[PDB]
């Protein structure tokens, strides 16, 4: 069995290997990369996402989100308070202000210590979930707006044609902006490209151990667990690496830098934070190996998790017994 300790693997494809996206994902899995839940892909030196980032300041962040925490430093939830619209130029200036900028630090480990010590005492503002792309249309390799769609994968594997579309999303971050513990919708893959700016630190639980994280979360968030049998789908709960180690939960960590791709694999729980002003692009995708995870994915029916139009069909075809109840949640 390849990668039996479930370590995060780092790949350096050549320009020739970068041509065929599906084939390279399958290669990485042949080496055991999926067992970690997360892999890093460093593009060949010949590749670029676009020519420059000099002209992005007029992108609008229609609904910036202030991430307000409750709890203790290592075990907390966050809620998203909606703020007034601002441009990416306005948000970058805000991120760099004395109230929100990254503190002085020695290295990524010192900054990680500072994040876990102090996160709860501040409320950073995240420009998340913005439909769009920063890849140049002429970038032919690993262009996250030109991937094969999940609807087409389902159709190719299972024969059923379904409605829905699959497009990328932009994320503009600042120091302390936080992504809560989650798997993807319908336990899909994700791919995330850090276009510019400061790093993003990730934490991940191997897919084979995901239920250990769920059991800890039910213990640590006992009211939320009674409310919803899949409350991690709400994407609000944080648990620190120190707390995970104290409870014996297997996990790994890695820091993504500008110019690097990360891939999350089906049922790989992940969480993390941004080091300072940055911009990432991400999208969900599927392979043949996803189908069995999609069939088994948990679902939130309490009404909180509220998701895309295109998840309807995935539930309806892969999980017809759950369909009715899930759809009641969404209406
Ligand atoms: O970058 C973020 O805030 C969160 N991203 C993801 O969870 C991902 O790419 O799957
Ligand atoms: Mg612009
Ligand atoms: Ni994710
Ligand atoms: Zn729920």
Curated annotation (Swiss-Prot):
Co-factor(s): Fe(2+)
GO biological process: cellular response to ionizing radiation; chromatin remodeling; double-strand break repair via homologous recombination; inflammatory response; positive regulation of chromatin binding; positive regulation of double-strand break repair via nonhomologous end joining; regulation of gene expression; regulation of protein phosphorylation
Annotated binding of Zn(2+), by residue: 228, 234, 300, 302
Keywords: ADP-ribosylation, Chromatin regulator, Dioxygenase, Iron, Metal-binding, Nucleus, Oxidoreductase, Transcription, Transcription regulation, Ubl conjugation, Zinc
The UniProt record lists the keyword Heme: no
Post-translational modification: Ubiquitinated via 'Lys-63'-linked ubiquitin chains. Deubiquitinated by USP14 with the help of TRIM14 leading to stabilization.
GO molecular function, one term: histone H3K9 demethylase activity
Positions of the JmjC domain: 136-302
Coiled coil regions in record: none
Cofactor note: Binds 1 Fe(2+) ion per subunit.
Catalytic reactions of this protein: N(6),N(6),N(6)-trimethyl-L-lysyl(9)-[histone H3] + 2 2-oxoglutarate + 2 O2 = N(6)-methyl-L-lysyl(9)-[histone H3] + 2 formaldehyde + 2 succinate + 2 CO2
Binding-site residues for Fe cation, renumbered to this chain: 182, 184, 270
Protein residues bound to 2-oxoglutarate: 126, 192, 200, 235
One GO cellular component term: nucleus
Superkingdom per UniProt: Eukaryota
The EC number(s) this enzyme carries: 1.14.11.66
PolyADP-ribosyl glutamic acid modification, residue list: 16-17
Subcellular location: Nucleus
UniProt KW Cytoplasm keyword: no
Residue ranges constituting the JmjN domain according to the UniProt record: 8-50
Primary enzyme class: oxidoreductase
Function: Histone demethylase that specifically demethylates 'Lys-9' of histone H3, thereby playing a central role in histone code. Does not demethylate histone H3 'Lys-4', H3 'Lys-27', H3 'Lys-36' nor H4 'Lys-20'. Demethylates both di- and trimethylated H3 'Lys-9' residue, while it has no activity on monomethylated residues. Demethylation of Lys residue generates formaldehyde and succinate.
Homology family: Belongs to the JHDM3 histone demethylase family.
Name of the protein: Lysine-specific demethylase 4D
Source species of the chain: Homo sapiens
Parent sequence residues shown: 11 to 341 of 523
């Amino acid at each position: 069995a390849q990668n039996p300790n479930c370590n995060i693997m780092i790949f350096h494809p050549t320009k020739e290997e970068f041509n065929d996206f599906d084939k390279y994902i399958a290669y990485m899995e042949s080496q055991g990369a999926h067992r970690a839940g997360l892999a890093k892909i460093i593009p060949p030196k010949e590749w670029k996402a676009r020519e420059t980032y000099d002209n992005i300041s007029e992108i609008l962040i229609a609904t910036p989100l202030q991430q307000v925490a409750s709890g203790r430093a290592g075990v907390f939830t966050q809620y998203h308070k909606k703020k007034k619209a601002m441009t990416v130029g306005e948000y970058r200036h805000l991120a760099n202000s004395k109230k929100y900028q990254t503190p002085p630090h020695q290295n990524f480990e010192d900054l990680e210590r500072k994040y876990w010590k102090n996160r709860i005492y501040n409320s950073p503002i995240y420009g998340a979930d913005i439909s769009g792309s920063l890849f140049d249309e002429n970038t032919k390799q690993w262009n996250l707006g030109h991937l094969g769609t999940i609807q087409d994968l389902l159709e190719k594997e299972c024969g059923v044609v379904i409605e829905g579309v699959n497009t990328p999303y932009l994320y503009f971050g600042m120091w302390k902006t936080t992504f809560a513990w989650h798997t993807e919708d319908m336990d899909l893959y994700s791919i995330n490209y850090l276009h510019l700016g400061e790093p993003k630190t990730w934490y991940v639980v191997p897919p084979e151990h995901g239920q250990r994280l769920e059991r800890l979360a039910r213990e640590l968030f006992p009211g939320s667990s009674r409310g919803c049998g899949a409350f991690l789908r709400h994407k609000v709960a944080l648990i620190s690496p120190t707390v995970l180690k104290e409870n014996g939960i297997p996990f790994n960590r890695i820091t993504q830098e500008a110019g690097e791709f990360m891939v999350t694999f089906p049922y790989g729980y992940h969480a993390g934070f941004n080091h300072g002003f940055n911009c990432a692009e991400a999208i969900n995708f599927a392979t043949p190996r996803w189908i069995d995870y999609g069939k088994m994915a948990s679902q939130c029916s309490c009404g909180e998790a509220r998701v895309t139009f295109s998840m309807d069909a995935f539930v309806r075809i892969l999980q017809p017994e759950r369909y009715d109840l899930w759809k009641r949640g969404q209406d």
